[PDB]
Amino acid sequence: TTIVALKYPGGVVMAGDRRSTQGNMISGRDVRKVYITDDYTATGIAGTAAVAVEFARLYAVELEHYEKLEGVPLTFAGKINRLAIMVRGNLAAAMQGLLALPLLAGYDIHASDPQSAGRIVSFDAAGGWNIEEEGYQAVGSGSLFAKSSMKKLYSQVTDGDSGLRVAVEALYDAADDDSATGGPDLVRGIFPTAVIIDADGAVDVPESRIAELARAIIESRS
């Protein structure tokens, strides 16, 4: 599994792959790994497949519960603290074989400059969090290749289309260098899933755009 996220002027984008594997045998082909937690945040969890779906659902329930109870949504720091506590509380389960590595992307509506209101937060095993300042981050078993690809491709990002294209290219490279990550499926018609967050909110990217970008990249690489 591999999930990438990067910042562009005016928003932030996230993407992930669709492959599930039990050892060396492929057991999943259309797994979704990116979720819309609230109106302005998205989460992506890597690791054991069973734990991630539970994790995201618990996180969304917690945020909605606080919103309904207090009548006002939490600040970004509060959300980061809640996620960090949730990650910290799973150390024994991770030791016994249930590991979850989350990635957070969001848009801060209470900031000063609207063109730099996007945030990317990464977490460690112990429960420490860091706010990215380079503009991109990746998690999973093929995150090194995707990060190395983004390091070279980040200079071309100016808007929401360039960021999506760069994310798709990074996912393609990660699938190229790692067998646990699934690449685009042309025979079946399965493509990665992406989410874009801007001043209007978090929206899902239609499959047609991702298919067009993947076809362009594949024909370019030939």
Binding site: E70, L74, T75, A77, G78, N81, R82
Partner: peptide, 12 residues
């Protein structure tokens, strides 16, 4: 400590 310093209001 649970959430943040800016999440505390006098109404609560």
């Amino acid at each position: 400590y649970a959430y943040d310093r800016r999440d505390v209001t006098g109404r609560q």
